[PDB]
Design a protein around this ligand. Structure first.
Ligand code: 33B
Length: 97
């Protein structure tokens, strides 16, 4: 799989055009790599069931848009204003940085 600090792309179906995942960080605030960290993944959802996502990993860009520096609210707004499948780069947030 992707190594710690390795950038990987994943495609996830937003599932019934609505997702409702959660995040934290963004504005380079307290969280280690300043990124959006996946604060919570709902179970039974696309993110969980597809397994391209887990808590602790961080989102880099959403649909191309460099999301780093974007706020935690803007993070999810950006995940909303996607198409059917969400293309978004993650970086492993396992890395104790
Ligand atoms: C999921 C969780 O634990 N916390 C959470 C979830 C969602 C939000 N804010 N969502 C949101 C969605 C859309 C927009 N604007 C658009 O036009 C796309 C906004 S904004 O306008 O406020 O940027 C926000 C917040 C939170 S929080 O953890 O309570 O911040």
């Amino acid at each position: 799989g992707p190594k710690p600090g390795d950038i990987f792309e994943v495609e996830l179906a937003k599932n019934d055009n609505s997702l409702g995942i959660c995040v934290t960080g963004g504005v380079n605030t307290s969280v280690r790599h300043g990124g959006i960290y996946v604060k919570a993944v709902i179970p039974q959802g696309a993110a969980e069931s597809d397994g391209r996502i887990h808590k602790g990993d961080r989102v880099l860009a959403v649909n191309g848009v460099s999301l780093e520096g974007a706020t935690h609210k803007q993070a999810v707004c950006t995940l909303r204003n996607t198409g059917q499948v969400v293309h978004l780069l993650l970086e492993k947030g396992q890395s104790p940085t």
